[PDB]
Symmetry: D2
Subunit: 179 residues, 4 copies
């Protein structure tokens, strides 16, 4: 089977139209049914976005089906994505907050700073002793040590690095990027 068409939730499209004081009838020739409005591919949708002066993104907001189960989502140790770089392991991830990236890390250690990022970040040390380095004010390098149970908050776009303090003793941290 094959579909030539793009589907958009009708209720949603109508609601967008009403923000511009319009109704379906003010669109072109579009077929609709009881739940869906159909387009001849992306380019057709873009034109309609231009006409309504609304970013394309808006036409899908809400239209992906929640990955939750009864208001909640659960992940398991090793159940998701996992990779060597650090050893990164995804914790629970959800389409109900794409801005949220929760990680577990093993540190393999010893300088390789990142470039900072748009997310705020909080890190908690679950095991061992962690060397943290970051670029402070006036681009001066700073450092400190975090022990099991200690935590740190990091402002957006502050460059940073976590390594083992001891060397050989391999530590574990949790990192939550969000907002």
């Amino acid at each position: 089977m094959d579909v030539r068409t793009l589907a958009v939730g009708k209720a949603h499209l109508e609601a967008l139209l009403a923000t511009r004081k319009m109704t379906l009838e003010h669109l072109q020739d579009v077929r609709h049914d009881a739940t869906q409005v159909y387009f001849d591919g992306l380019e057709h949708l873009q034109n309609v976005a231009q006409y309504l002066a609304i970013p394309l993104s808006e036409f899908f907001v809400g239209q992906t089906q929640s990955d939750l189960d009864d208001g909640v989502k659960i992940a398991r140790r090793n159940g998701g994505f996992k990779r060597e770089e650090y050893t990164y392991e995804h914790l629970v991830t959800t389409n109900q907050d794409p801005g949220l990236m929760a990680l577990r890390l093993d540190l393999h250690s010893d300088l390789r700073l990142n470039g900072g990022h748009g997310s705020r970040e909080i890190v908690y040390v679950t095991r061992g002793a962690v060397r943290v380095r970051w670029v402070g004010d006036n681009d001066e390098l700073k450092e400190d040590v975090l022990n099991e149970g200690d935590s740190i908050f990091i402002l957006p776009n502050v460059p940073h690095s976590f390594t083992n303090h001891v060397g050989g003793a391999k530590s574990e941290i949790i990192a939550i990027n969000y907002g």
Copy 2:
């Protein structure tokens, strides 16, 4: 041409991927260019959205190109959308769009002629999410709205007067005089 095909900005996709600590290579089955990544149709994209655990919408957030020219956009009288509004078989308003822009879709600026008055039945709306400010450019305007404890309230606005309306407060503007047709400007936003 290929109407099925879906394009997604590469830089954006890459950035999304790096939020999940991935790269394009982890999507084995996609063509890309220098600027674009392409998908075989919607179903392909949905699968990828699942895999990355991100709503389909995310792939386009930010990607729309500004309709401004040098930080500004200009509209002309009658240059845009325009329409009559009839509520219960009562001709109520003529809506005219003022400037509209994709840089603030939440902004709806209107010019209105009023056609109804006290001889017609009342046709409130159901309020709306937007805040609203209205200015009277011409004539004398009857404004009615549902206040506290669902009690109906009313007042009259004259040329140069103005009113702010909290979200979801139901309201109606009509001519005070009846026959004398008034004009207002309405700005919905936020």
Copy 3:
């Protein structure tokens, strides 16, 4: 003596997983919690690690009457504006409300024109939309690469202005004095 809405303070406390009892040195009543002035409140803001501002968000009493507020022509603030000794505008407030301090709605008479020197502003954080109610308006603004641009707006025409774009409205004709509405917001 400082009063803070109890429901609000409690709600803030619960964000830090606390309750009133964890502030040992405060009297409360059914609706209000009381402090020994600002300095006492600042210490508590420190303790909760919350900006002082938060303790008042929502607490100013609405200036609306039944979900609405009304202003009258000439009823509010009004003022002349003179830039470099050039009479440029007459600003008149339209309705203003503490339920959206970010909203500044104005009516303006234009006094300047092309015979006067140009007096741009520095742009501003607010988005702005302008509608011409009367006459013909010369609009100038700094575009991309800091290049000056210009156009003319007639009765009924409108314009949207991105934040921090510097701009100026003047009469196109000179002597013929125009009127516009300007809405700054968000």
Copy 4:
């Protein structure tokens, strides 16, 4: 005497197209504008039609040092939680900062289990993610159509919780006491 940052006040004034001069009876210096206590400030808030909160937004001083803040085990607030008359949790604050009051990071010991009665909370505005650092955790929550649901989380498992979803974490094994990390935010 109340102090308000001059630059901030000026900026607020310019949103209403005003300047300091338009304030009846205020002293200023180079950095500060001064009021005769809160009531004076409230009147000015009325005059400008701006909530009182606005006069402090931004004005709390950052608790960060070089873009970062660090907390230590037991270094901050800590407390027992008793619901009905069942010892349920030991809350410990992790790093907290006035640069994101919406962020509440916690470490918890669990004391209750299936022999105790169930003590759900009422959900909350924050999103929440929880990670199990130690033991085995019984998690119960109110799902769709108000139906109670349950599952078990083991060391290293995690869970996301939508706003205002009511929930409870207890020990799966009575007596074996588990530990979790909870991050409320946004």
